């Protein structure tokens, strides 16, 4: 007559994820004109450890093509990516590592 532990897992409350020190969502940069028609360049600021995840994440800092603001992204870091490397991303990007083209 008792509910099993798995049914108790769906409610959350106790079985929810421990996302206090989790360093943001590891998202690939948003599509825009400079991903679709050519490439946009960003610097690798620092490879960083995320709690619960096994892969290190890379703070990659692009420059906003419309504002004078600067845009920081959290990529899942490719093996052999390093800090002070340029990451390119778009249709006319080149086919080497850490470099996100369609």
């Amino acid at each position: 007559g008792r509910v099993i532990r798995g049914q108790r897992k769906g409610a959350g409350s106790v079985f929810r994820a421990h996302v206090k020190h989790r360093k943001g969502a590891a998202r690939l940069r948003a599509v825009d004109f400079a991903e679709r028609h050519g490439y946009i360049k960003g610097i690798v600021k620092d490879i960083i450890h995320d709690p619960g995840r096994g892969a290190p994440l890379a703070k990659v800092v692009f420059r906003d093509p419309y504002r004078f603001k600067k845009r920081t992204e959290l990529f899942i870091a490719a093996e052999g990516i390093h800090t002070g490397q340029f990451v390119y991303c778009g249709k006319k990007a080149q086919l080497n590592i850490g470099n996100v083209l369609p």
Partner: protein, 225 residues
């Protein structure tokens, strides 16, 4: 003579080259919920096969003939609330010591004098909000042998009457001088609505895709041919 400091400083607006300039974004703005709704309402009147009882209101008395008509109708306007006193004040004068021909406003007055066959010309508006108020009236006029035309705007039809909007406007009687101009309006209107009504009943509206969905079809035609 010119200042050799004053230099050309050209901006390269390539990809990952400079800032992009403040160029036009009107056709990318995330609009309010109502502005989106009223716009993609106007688009569903172009995709969906509009039945010809509704499409017959897109067929409008064109610019030259509309402006021709309202100069005549401007004679036969119903008088204002302020002008109302100025005859009822003259009642108090003549008692102390004939009504002219006018326009007929509203669907209910107009329809009763289409069955009575008093209406000489019925001026219908195209933009009536629930269309059902007016849908039957082009059909009713054709059967009773009443000439009908359709203006663009209940607003500009509702300025003839001293109101905001009016659906329909009918002519019953006219001054004998203006008898000829109404007789000439009826001829251009009977031959453009009443006389070609059997083809109005067949003329479905919309069924026309988006301009870039036309363009993709029209490309696949050429890629074959």
């Amino acid at each position: 003579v010119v200042n050799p400091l004053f230099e050309k400083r050209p901006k390269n607006f390539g990809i990952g080259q400079d800032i992009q300039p403040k160029r036009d974004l009107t056709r990318f703005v995330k609009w309010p919920r109502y502005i989106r709704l009223q716009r993609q309402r106007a688009i569903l009147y172009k995709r969906l096969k509009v039945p010809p009882a509704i499409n017959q209101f897109t067929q409008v008395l064109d610019r030259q003939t509309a402006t021709q008509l309202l100069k005549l109708a401007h004679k036969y306007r119903p008088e204002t609330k302020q002008e109302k006193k100025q005859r009822l004040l003259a009642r108090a004068e003549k008692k102390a010591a004939k009504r002219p021909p006018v326009l007929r406003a509203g669907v209910n007055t107009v329809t009763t004098l289409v069955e009575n066959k008093k209406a000489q010309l019925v001026v219908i508006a195209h933009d009536v909000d629930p269309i059902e108020l007016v849908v039957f009236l082009p059909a009713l006029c054709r059967k009773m042998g009443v000439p009908y035309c359709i203006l663009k705007g209940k607003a500009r039809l509702c300025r003839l009457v001293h109101r905001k909007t009016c659906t329909t406007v009918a002519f019953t009687q006219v001054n004998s001088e203006d008898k000829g101009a109404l007789a000439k309006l009826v001829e251009a209107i009977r031959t453009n609505y009443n006389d070609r009504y059997d083809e109005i009943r067949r003329h479905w509206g919309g069924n026309v895709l988006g301009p870039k969905s036309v363009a993709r079809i029209a490309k696949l035609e050429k890629a074959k041919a």
